[PDB]
Amino acid sequence: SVGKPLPHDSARAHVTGQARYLDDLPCPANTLHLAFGLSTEASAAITGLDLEPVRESPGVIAVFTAADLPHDNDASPAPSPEPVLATGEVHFVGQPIFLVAATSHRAARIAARKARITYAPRPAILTLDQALAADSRFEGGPVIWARGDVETALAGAAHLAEGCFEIGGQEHFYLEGQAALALPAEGGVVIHCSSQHPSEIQHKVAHALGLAFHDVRVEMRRMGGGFGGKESQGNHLAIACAVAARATGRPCKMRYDRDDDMVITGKRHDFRIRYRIGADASGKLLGADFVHLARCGWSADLSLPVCDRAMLHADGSYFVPALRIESHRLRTNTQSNTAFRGFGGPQGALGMERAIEHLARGMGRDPAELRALNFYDPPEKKTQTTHYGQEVADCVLGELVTRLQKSANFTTRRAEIAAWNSTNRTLARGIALSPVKFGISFTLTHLNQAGALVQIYTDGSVALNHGGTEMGQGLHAKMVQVAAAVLGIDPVQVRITATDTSKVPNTSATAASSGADMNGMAVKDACETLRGRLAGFVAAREGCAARDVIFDAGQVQASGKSWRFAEIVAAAYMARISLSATGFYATPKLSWDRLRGQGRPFLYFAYGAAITEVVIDRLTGENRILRTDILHDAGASLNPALDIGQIEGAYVQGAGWLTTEELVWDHCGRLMTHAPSTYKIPAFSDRPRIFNVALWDQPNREETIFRSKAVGEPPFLLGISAFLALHDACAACGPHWPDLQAPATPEAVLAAVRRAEGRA
Amino acid sequence: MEIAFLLNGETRRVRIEDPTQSLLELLRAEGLTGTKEGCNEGDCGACTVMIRDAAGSRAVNACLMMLPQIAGKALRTIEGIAAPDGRLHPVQQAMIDHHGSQCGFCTPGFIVSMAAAHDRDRKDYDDLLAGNLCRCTGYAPILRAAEAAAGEPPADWLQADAAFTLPAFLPETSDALADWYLAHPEATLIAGGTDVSLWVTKALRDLPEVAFLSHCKDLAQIRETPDGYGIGAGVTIAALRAFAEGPHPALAGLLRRFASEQVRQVATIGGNIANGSPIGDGPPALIAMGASLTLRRGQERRRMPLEDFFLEYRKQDRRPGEFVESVTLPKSAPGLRCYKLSKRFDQDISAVCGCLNLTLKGSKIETARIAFGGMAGVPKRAAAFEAALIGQDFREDTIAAALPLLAQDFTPLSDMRASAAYRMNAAQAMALRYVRELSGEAVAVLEVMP
Numbered sequence A: 001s002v003g004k005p006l007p008h009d010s011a012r013a014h015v016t017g018q019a020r021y022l023d024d025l026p027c028p029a030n031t032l033h034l035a036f037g038l039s040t041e042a043s044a045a046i047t048g049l050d051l052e053p054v055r056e057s058p059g060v061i062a063v064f065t066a067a068d069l070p071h072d073n074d075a076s077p078a079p080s081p082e083p084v085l086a087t088g089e090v091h092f093v094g095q096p097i098f099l100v101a102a103t104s105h106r107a108a109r110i111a112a113r114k115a116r117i118t119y120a121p122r123p124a125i126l127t128l129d130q131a132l133a134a135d136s137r138f139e140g141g142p143v144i145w146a147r148g149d150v151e152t153a154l155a156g157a158a159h160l161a162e163g164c165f166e167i168g169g170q171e172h173f174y175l176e177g178q179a180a181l182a183l184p185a186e187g188g189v190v191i192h193c194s195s196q197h198p199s200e201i202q203h204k205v206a207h208a209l210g211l212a213f214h215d216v217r218v219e220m221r222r223m224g225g226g227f228g229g230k231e232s233q234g235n236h237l238a239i240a241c242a243v244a245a246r247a248t249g250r251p252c253k254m255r256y257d258r259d260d261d262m263v264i265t266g267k268r269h270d271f272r273i274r275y276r277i278g279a280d281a282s283g284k285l286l287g288a289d290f291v292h293l294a295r296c297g298w299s300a301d302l303s304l305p306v307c308d309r310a311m312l313h314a315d316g317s318y319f320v321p322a323l324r325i326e327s328h329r330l331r332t333n334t335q336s337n338t339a340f341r342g343f344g345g346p347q348g349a350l351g352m353e354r355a356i357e358h359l360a361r362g363m364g365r366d367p368a369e370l371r372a373l374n375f376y377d378p379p380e381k382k383t384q385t386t387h388y389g390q391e392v393a394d395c396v397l398g399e400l401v402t403r404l405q406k407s408a409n410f411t412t413r414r415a416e417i418a419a420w421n422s423t424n425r426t427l428a429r430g431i432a433l434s435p436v437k438f439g440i441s442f443t444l445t446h447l448n449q450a451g452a453l454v455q456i457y458t459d460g461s462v463a464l465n466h467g468g469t470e471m472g473q474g475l476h477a478k479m480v481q482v483a484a485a486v487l488g489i490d491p492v493q494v495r496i497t498a499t500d501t502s503k504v505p506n507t508s509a510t511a512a513s514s515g516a517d518m519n520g521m522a523v524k525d526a527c528e529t530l531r532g533r534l535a536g537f538v539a540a541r542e543g544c545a546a547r548d549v550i551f552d553a554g555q556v557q558a559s560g561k562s563w564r565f566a567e568i569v570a571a572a573y574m575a576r577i578s579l580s581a582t583g584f585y586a587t588p589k590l591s592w593d594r595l596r597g598q599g600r601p602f603l604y605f606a607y608g609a610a611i612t613e614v615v616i617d618r619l620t621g622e623n624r625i626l627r628t629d630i631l632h633d634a635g636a637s638l639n640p641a642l643d644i645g646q647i648e649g650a651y652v653q654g655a656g657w658l659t660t661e662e663l664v665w666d667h668c669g670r671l672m673t674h675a676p677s678t679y680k681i682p683a684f685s686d687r688p689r690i691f692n693v694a695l696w697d698q699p700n701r702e703e704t705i706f707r708s709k710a711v712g713e714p715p716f717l718l719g720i721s722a723f724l725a726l727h728d729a730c731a732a733c734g735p736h737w738p739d740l741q742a743p744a745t746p747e748a749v750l751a752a753v754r755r756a757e758g759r760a
Numbered sequence B: 001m002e003i004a005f006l007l008n009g010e011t012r013r014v015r016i017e018d019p020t021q022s023l024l025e026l027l028r029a030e031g032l033t034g035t036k037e038g039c040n041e042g043d044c045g046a047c048t049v050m051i052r053d054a055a056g057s058r059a060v061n062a063c064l065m066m067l068p069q070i071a072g073k074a075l076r077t078i079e080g081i082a083a084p085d086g087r088l089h090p091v092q093q094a095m096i097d098h099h100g101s102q103c104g105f106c107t108p109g110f111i112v113s114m115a116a117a118h119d120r121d122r123k124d125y126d127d128l129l130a131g132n133l134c135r136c137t138g139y140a141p142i143l144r145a146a147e148a149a150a151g152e153p154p155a156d157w158l159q160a161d162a163a164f165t166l167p168a169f170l171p172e173t174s175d176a177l178a179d180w181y182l183a184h185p186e187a188t189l190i191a192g193g194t195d196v197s198l199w200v201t202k203a204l205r206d207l208p209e210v211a212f213l214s215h216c217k218d219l220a221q222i223r224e225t226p227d228g229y230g231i232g233a234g235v236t237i238a239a240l241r242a243f244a245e246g247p248h249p250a251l252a253g254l255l256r257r258f259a260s261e262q263v264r265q266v267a268t269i270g271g272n273i274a275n276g277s278p279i280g281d282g283p284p285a286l287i288a289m290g291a292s293l294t295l296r297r298g299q300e301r302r303r304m305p306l307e308d309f310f311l312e313y314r315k316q317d318r319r320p321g322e323f324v325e326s327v328t329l330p331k332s333a334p335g336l337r338c339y340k341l342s343k344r345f346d347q348d349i350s351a352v353c354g355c356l357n358l359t360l361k362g363s364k365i366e367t368a369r370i371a372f373g374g375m376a377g378v379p380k381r382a383a384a385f386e387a388a389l390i391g392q393d394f395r396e397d398t399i400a401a402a403l404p405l406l407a408q409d410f411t412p413l414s415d416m417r418a419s420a421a422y423r424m425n426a427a428q429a430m431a432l433r434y435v436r437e438l439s440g441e442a443v444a445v446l447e448v449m450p
């Protein structure tokens, strides 16, 4: 069943509005609603907290403060604590300080606005520069990795390019907002939430309540969107519902209204990237020195692995004999940043793509040949390594890019564009090619495990359950296919059940694009135990050998006889053979040392490339993507329809990141862009007018579930091509370095058009 | 107060006690969980629902619509898009076949918009779905779906609603309105409700003393006049757009990027003007075309030129008891040209809106109407610029030399949408644009075909 282009497990339910998300669940009439009261100061001690007007607000049942917390007050996914309710001081505009439970969501919000809080303000850190000045940071000092000797290599270099550029953050904008629901359950609780990481929710609620893990169960059936924003920021809502529930004796639901969501939660880390890169006379790179400054917010959250991932990708798609990275994770008084599709990858990768482009303009060379010249070598004495020391034995970029360039009609089109530009004075077209190489697996190694549990009932239908969470990426349909393929039966006989920490325990977040790689293995591991039990049973009965029992297409075959899968199962039942099984998988070959920056942190790399063509208006900066052509490597895809769909969606998400999406804070720390009306994701007409996507179809070298490759995050990096194209268009307006900064909004494109035009 | 309407084929009668509750909440509270809440501010489309009445059917955002408004109408939500026997609508099956959904959460709203478009056979997809955001799919597959379902006979069960109907004040006539407003000067007048509902959903306000103008047929008329067209205050932006396609394409092209189709379907020009926002898109345009506005108080009736209605940021020439009743447009203005500049093209607020109208005496500039929104606390003509322009020749360089006067006409702000420098520079760029366009040159990024 693997390999077929089958619809998402919940297509019909989606399309008829039957699919339920967290806020649609039926709940008892006595359920309370919660809302947080937020700090209005970026940095201050809290001096007075009058909650009386809150308690007196209509419909309000209970009001809570850090001192009401019965046990832990800590939502962080990391060893350093992040309070759920403010403890005597606040650290950003938006930090929750108290909690209201009322008999309605509105009534909660309204009350949450009536407190009288007095603060003692303190100097706030809001800019990287301020942070550096003040030495406000995480990990007590920068992280530095080095291969060979850069300064030596850059001192003796025929060509060289130095530059500095900003990369702004990004808000997830999951259409369904954070949300959770807690139901007292005699002794313990049951939490329903909308999260990519139910085991952590379990862990954090348990600690908040003083309970062993076995008294807290978390179920989660689907999220309307995650993109990394729910790897952890689900912790606050759940903690709050559990605590309210324990205290009021009643079920408690919390959903953030959009504005609150954008003011409380984290975003993709913004970066400042400083680079020096250089090359040979032939064009081979000699070295690259990068410095990364990353804005992380007030608490560490997932900054650590995020910044590690950016370091790990500062090589982009290229072999580089000498390379250095010095990575600052800067603490500031703003929203604590977090995971977002790509998880550091795109920031580090975009750092090297900018550089190499800068280098290319500098030597008057075509960016594409320069890149093509420096890709790691094809596979098949001494294989090249990355700067962290990992052999790169599967780089198909060379072939792939070539193939894309032909299908894309690259060369011809570039000329058509040159001509067209020279004939125009108000508009200018631009086009760029950009490659992608993304490692798969969590860099914190021990998260690379996954479990599953499968059951066959006596009518032959099957219930599959695994640890990943569905957020739209088609995970559930893929596991349905893996199971129906491993048991020999039609997918329609397989039903997926809600993710539930009481069925598969100790799971990792669904993330790092490892959802299908690992859960797929676990599902197969379980399905294979089952099949083994059935073959063993058919074989003894029909006197013959297990390996000769065939399961296929709903039929079982043995010794010339043939039967429906159900009849085999009923007989196994009568013969007393267990029809239930767990499955588990731990990714092999991984091992590396963060501090030294050496090892094999990834199992394999995914690759792809895109060519984007855009146009810009030289008077205002207005602009748009005209056409995109992508060729991406999803291994032997498990579902090409679902893969093509991730790729398309991730592309638009990436280009969104580097064009209209922009976060802005005011002088005092307030987020000004906190609503769709001021934070602008790609809208329907922003889609490319011509959008060709195709898959490279080559099995993975590594032993992954049916030799497929993760396809969730990698494709997000293809959006760089659009930024590279915007920059090609600026470069056509003049002879100077346009120095286009990200996000390339119209104001920013206009600024780069002027520098190039030399008008300042 | 009781209202009635058809809900997904069924007759429904409801006791309104809070006239301000949005349609989105009534619904989810009735268990019609299929309509989702994605922003509660008009931007996402996720709450889109389909209404119908004599004018026909359209898709609108349930989060912006309070109950009183749907009296006498037929309402269709996502749960009623399928046929009673369970057959899926051509748009639903197409979405399944073409993978138009991933997480599913914006799927209803898309399906409802799509179904509405299908019902009237509209095919301008980019404009019809602008107001439905999807963060997961890239949009491509949703287009394939719309295309694929367009070759399918419309759903019969959806058109049968046509046969239907055949605290807070709800006037039926402008006279009834005028009378009552005059007695309750302090009332809150609600037309489309697209700016007011944000006072209750986000600012968490509470509005007593309320009146709905959407049921005054006579306030929502387009009348041909001896010397122009008379546009009632209650005319919706969508309708004003449809009218303008002929005599005022430029204004028509502008209104294309006014919010989304869902908001256009209910927002009113009267409301866009009474709101008095310096970033309104209506005003600048109208002023460049030199229209006029008509206020009214009981039986009295003033009548100034639009630009004169705006005194200062947040303050208008409006009298206690007085309300906007219409605006009047000339029969023609081929010189009009409207420019909107924002971070994103569709469904965005203007950093700057530039409206230009220059009349010529062959090569010479006779009259100059130049308006801007978002350059000041108020929409206003650029006097010093206008002035210096008269009598001069209509060539790029003359304009190039007058630009600086703009820095005297305005001193723009900086904020999250744009920096002052950029705003300024953009107002100036609009001026270069105008000459270049009139001189037949390629200037618009949106007209470039791949």
Ligand SMILES: Cc1cc2nc3c(=O)[nH]c(=O)nc-3n(C[C@H](O)[C@H](O)[C@H](O)COP(=O)(O)OP(=O)(O)OC[C@H]3O[C@@H](n4cnc5c(N)ncnc54)[C@H](O)[C@@H]3O)c2cc1C
Pocket: B041, B042, B043, B064, B188, B189, B190, B191, B192, B193, B194, B195, B196, B197, B213, B233, B234, B257, B258, B259, B260, B263, B266, B267, B268, B269, B270, B271, B272, B273, B274, B275, B279, B280, B281, B282, B322, B323, B324, B325, B348, B349, B350
């Ligand atoms: C998602 C979204 C996108 C938007 N995009 C744009 C856009 O791009 N451009 C733009 O200009 N605006 C935009 N708006 C706001 C725009 O003004 C409103 O959408 C609309 O034009 C106001 O029309 P209305 O009838 O709904 O005003 P209402 O919300 O009904 O309110 C009008 C305001 O004026 C008063 N009022 C209404 N009618 C009268 C009357 N005739 N006499 C006196 N006072 C009256 C009301 O009491 C209120 O103060 C957008 C809003 C949203 C929700």
Ligand SMILES: Nc1nc2c(c(=O)[nH]1)N[C@H]1C(S)=C(S)[C@@H](COP(=O)(O)O)O[C@H]1N2
Pocket: A225, A226, A227, A228, A340, A341, A342, A468, A471, A472, A473, A475, A510, A511, A512, A513, A514, A515, A516, A517, A646, A649, A710, A711, A712, A713, B102, B103, B136, B137
């Ligand atoms: N439709 C949709 N696709 C998505 C997301 C989502 O939130 N919605 N999250 C992404 C992120 S951040 C990851 S890490 C992968 C996870 O997919 P996987 O389970 O197959 O690893 O899905 C990606 N694709």
Ligand code: MOS
Pocket: A196, A227, A228, A229, A231, A339, A340, A341, A342, A343, A510, A511, A512, A513, A713
């Ligand atoms: O960003 Mo995906 O690692 S949750």
Ligand code: FES
Pocket: B036, B037, B038, B039, B040, B041, B042, B043, B044, B045, B046, B047, B048, B061, B062, B063, B064
């Ligand atoms: S909830 Fe987003 S438009 Fe109504």
Ligand code: FES
Pocket: A175, A224, A225, A472, B100, B101, B102, B103, B104, B105, B106, B107, B133, B134, B135, B136, B137
């Ligand atoms: S499918 Fe997730 S928002 Fe459209």
Ligand SMILES: [Ca+2]
Pocket: A171, A172, A173, A229, A261, A262, A265, A266, A267
């Ligand atoms: Ca977020």
